[PDB]
């Protein structure tokens, strides 16, 4: 084999498989070619930005990855040296891990990877019936299913989660079963192992807590078992727990609003408690407000500690955690300024109050229409309002500086006042003759009319047009993002659970077929999905 660092370990068998020469592969295997040689040169590794092609470093994985069913069948089932199907590379990836890794979710890629995955698994069952091939974990601890979920390979995940194999001595490999049938109706059973909970790399946890760079994190939850599974968990318990949380937060904000509204107007806190009923209720409300702020503070800290976002995933993603955390930060700064004898605690408190009432929009998830609407609000803020505010603020600052330069020795002639007066045009309140403290009236009115045309007539109506294009284009994306948000809510509610709920599983230890590789009966905690098909009588 090659000794060069770029192609270290490449045998002639790798070239023969690459060249799709079946006869050369047969001759090489006949002459004792090693069928578990590790081609681990720098060309064959990951880091796709460099030139290279990763296939799992082994010739069986090469033959599988290149869509050569004959060569994988031969290498597993040759007379001289059968290849170990559970062989592992430097990463710990098996053949199925390599097939998952090379997928890119295109139609032809999904077709061949699905077929090769199926055939490799079937051959593994035939040659090694006792082997649980799909339970092998690489050095990152990921099974092929967990690798598919973590990497966003929706084409492979969507195949695996509803896999049907009908051949005798292979039905145990299936993950979708049929318990019974009638005429148009039949009841399907989905495996559900390592989906709802396995304490390591459950598919729901892997998808929901992805780092936002996964290509299809929003689309992966639309597959047949996961969507119904999340809806079932929702309607089982999380709808009630979530609505209770929403009610509690509403009470919290009502109490905070009441306590802040009736703050004492005297100077220099802390305020002596006058012996009267209203002030006792006020002090109780303030204490509850600070208590809830501390609660959200520690919840945010727990989020950041449990997840450890890598300094960008907490700005591109998970906005609600940041917003609730900042609300609590404003509350705690308000407490510090309150006991420090500073009036600025009112400033911190009112920012906390406004932010909390706007964070009430968090709970629109769990309601489909309001949740999708809130998702669209998020996308408008991030894409259209951001571009608009960049260009708008550039124009506002430019024309404000020109106008305040023109104005001389007046009640205006500060940059702030002129900026505010030019901003008033945006809200339909611009005076257009707010001062006469200038010379050159034509210059003043030309500047203001140019500002009006460029901002109020052009940019606001253009913002309406671009938001129209956006709502025309983000419908399906908004529904998927809402479903992902509700999924994250479901997982957090299940992981909090507050009473040691035993009902973590969905639908009982149903017997699927009861034909393992041995004579034993396998129970898999299945999930039932009743389906109707008028075709295929």
CB 114 within 8 A of CB 159: yes
- By CB under 6 A, the residues from 134 to 163 that bind ligand XJ7 are none
Q: How far is CA 6 from CA 41, 55, 90, 210, in A?
A: 5, 15, 15, 33
Give yes or no for residue 482 binding ligand XJ7 (CB under 6 A): no
- 323 contacts which partner out of ligand 6IY, its own copies, ligand XJ7, none, CB within 5 to 8 A by kind? ligand XJ7
Q: Which of 280, 275, 274 is nearest to 259 (CA)?
A: 280
Residue written as tokens 């419908």? 475
- 69 contacts which partner out of ligand XJ7, its own copies, ligand 6IY, none, CB within 5 to 8 A by kind? none
- By CB under 6 A, the residues from 351 to 390 that bind ligand 6IY are none
Residue written as tokens 């709802």? 196
Residues 6+ apart with CB under 8 A from 107: none
Give yes or no for residue 115 binding its own copies (CB under 8 A): no
- By CB under 8 A, the residues from 327 to 346 that bind its own copies are 343-344, 346
Q: State whether residue 148 is helix, strand or coil.
A: helix
Of the candidate spans 215-223, 247-255, 273-281, 414-422, the one that interacts with ligand 6IY by CB under 6 A turns out to be 414-422
Rank residues 24 and 377 by Cβ distance to its own copies and give the closer one.
377
287, 360, 446, 464: residue in contact with ligand 6IY (rule CB under 6 A): 446
- By CB under 8 A, the residues from 405 to 434 that bind its own copies are 405-406, 408-409, 415, 420, 423-433
Give yes or no for residue 477 binding ligand XJ7 (CB under 6 A): no
| Residue 270: cis peptide before it, omega within 30 degrees of 0 | yes
CB of 363 to ligand 6IY, least distance (A): 21
Cα 121 from Cα 145, distance rounded (Å)? 13
281, 319, 456, 525: residue in contact with ligand XJ7 (rule CB under 6 A): 319
Residues 6+ apart with CB under 8 A from 408: 437, 438, 439
Q: Is 263 within any annotated ligand binding site?
A: no
DSSP character string of 264-305 = --SSSSSPP--SSHHHHHHHHHHHHHHHHHHHHHHHHHHHHH
500: left (phi over 0), alpha (psi -120 to 50) or beta: left
Rank residues 111 and 495 by Cβ distance to ligand XJ7 and give the closer one.
495
Beta bridge partners of 190: 176, 527
Over the Cα atoms of the chain, what is R_g?
A: 32
The kind and range of the H/E element at 491 are helix 475-496
- By CB under 6 A, the residues from 451 to 470 that bind ligand XJ7 are 454
- 479 contacts which partner out of ligand 6IY, its own copies, ligand XJ7, none, CB within 5 to 8 A by kind? its own copies
Find the DSSP H helices in 1-106: 12-18, 22-30, 59-65, 69-77, 95-102
- 373 contacts which partner out of ligand 6IY, ligand XJ7, its own copies, none, CB within 5 to 8 A by kind? its own copies
CB of 448 to its own copies, least distance (A): 10
Cα 194 from Cα 188, distance rounded (Å)? 18
Q: Which of 437, 439, 456, 464 is nearest to 399 (CA)?
A: 456
Give yes or no for residue 449 binding ligand 6IY (CB under 6 A): yes
CB of 257 to ligand 6IY, least distance (A): 11
- The pair phi, psi for residue 186, each rounded to 5°, is -155, 150
Q: Is 19 within any annotated ligand binding site?
A: yes
CB of 320 to ligand XJ7, least distance (A): 3
**Beta carbons within 10 angstroms of residue 56's beta carbon:** 27
Give yes or no for residue 235 binding its own copies (CB under 8 A): no
CB of 316 to ligand XJ7, least distance (A): 8
Rank residues 37 and 322 by Cβ distance to ligand XJ7 and give the closer one.
322
Q: Is 8 within any annotated ligand binding site?
A: yes
CB of 408 to ligand XJ7, least distance (A): 20
39, 149, 230, 255: residue in contact with its own copies (rule CB under 8 A): 230
Rank residues 98 and 157 by Cβ distance to ligand XJ7 and give the closer one.
157
CB of 411 to ligand 6IY, least distance (A): 8
Rank residues 74 and 249 by Cβ distance to ligand XJ7 and give the closer one.
249
Find the DSSP H helices in 308-344: 319-339
Site size with ligand XJ7, rule: CB under 6 A: 22
Residues in contact with ligand 6IY by the rule CB under 6 A = 414-417, 419-420, 423, 441-442, 445-446, 449
Binding-site sequence positions for Na(+): 428
Annotated binding site: 7-10, 18-19, 319-320, 358, 365, 428, 431
């Amino acid at each position: 084999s090659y000794t060069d660092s770029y192609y270290k370990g490449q045998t002639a068998l790798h070239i023969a498989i690459e060249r799709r020469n079946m006869t050369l592969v047969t001759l090489l295997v006949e002459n004792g070619a090693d069928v578990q040689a590790a081609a681990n040169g720098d060309f064959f590794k990951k880091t796709k930005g460099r030139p290279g092609f990763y296939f799992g470093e082994l010739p069986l994985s090469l033959a599988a990855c290149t869509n050569q069913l004959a060569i994988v069948k031969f290498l597993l089932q040759n007379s001289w040296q059968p290849a170990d199907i559970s062989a592992r590379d430097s990463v710990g990836n098996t053949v199925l891990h390599a097939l998952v890794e090379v997928a890119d979710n295109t139609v032809d890629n999904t077709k061949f990877v699905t077929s090769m995955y199926n055939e490799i698994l079937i051959l593994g069952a035939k040659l090694h019936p006792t082997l649980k091939l799909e339970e092998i974990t690489n050095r990152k601890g990921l099974t092929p299913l967990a690798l598919a979920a973590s990497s966003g390979k929706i084409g492979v995940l969507a195949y695996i989660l509803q896999r049907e194999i009908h051949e005798p001595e292979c039905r145990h490999l299936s993950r979708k079963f049929t318990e019974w049938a009638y005429g148009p109706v039949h009841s399907s059973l989905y495996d559900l192992s390592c989906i709802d909970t396995c304490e390591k790399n459950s598919v729901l946890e892997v998808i929901a807590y992805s780092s936002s760079e996964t290509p299809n994190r929003h689309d992966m939850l639309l597959v047949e078992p996961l969507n119904r599974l999340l809806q079932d968990k929702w309607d089982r318990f999380v709808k009630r727990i979530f609505y209770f949380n929403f009610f509690v937060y509403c009470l919290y904000m009502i109490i905070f609003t009441a306590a802040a509204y009736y703050r004492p107007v005297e100077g220099l806190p802390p305020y002596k408690l006058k012996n009267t009923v209203g002030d006792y209720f006020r002090v109780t409300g303030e204490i509850l407000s600070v208590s809830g702020g501390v609660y959200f503070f520690f919840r945010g800290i727990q989020y950041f500690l449990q997840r450890r976002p890598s300094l960008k995933s907490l700005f591109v993603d998970s906005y609600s955690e940041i917003l609730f955390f900042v609300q609590s930060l404003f509350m705690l700064v308000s407490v510090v300024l309150y006991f420090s004898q500073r009036k600025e605690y009112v400033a911190s408190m009112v920012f906390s109050l406004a932010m909390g009432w706007t964070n009430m929009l968090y709970y629109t998830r769990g309601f489909q229409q309001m949740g999708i609407y809130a998702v669209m609000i998020e996308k408008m803020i991030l894409r259209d309002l951001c571009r608009f505010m960049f260009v708008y603020l550039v124009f506002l600052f430019g024309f404000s500086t020109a106008v305040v330069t023109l104005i001389e020795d007046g009640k205006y002639n500060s940059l702030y006042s002129t900026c505010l007066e030019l901003f008033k045009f945006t809200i339909g309140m611009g005076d257009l003759e707010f001062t006469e403290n200038y010379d050159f009236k034509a210059v003043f009115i030309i500047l203001l009319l140019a500002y009006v045309i460029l901002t109020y007539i052009l940019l606001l109506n253009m913002l309406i047009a671009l938001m129209g294009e956006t709502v025309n284009k983000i419908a399906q994306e908004s529904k998927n993002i809402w479903k992902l948000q509700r999924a994250i809510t479901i997982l957090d509610t299940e992981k909090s659970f507050l009473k040691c709920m035993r009902k973590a599983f969905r639908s009982g230890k149903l017997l699927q077929v009861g034909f393992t590789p041995d004579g034993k009966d396998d129970y898999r905690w299945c999930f039932r999905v009743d389906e109707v098909n008028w075709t295929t009588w």
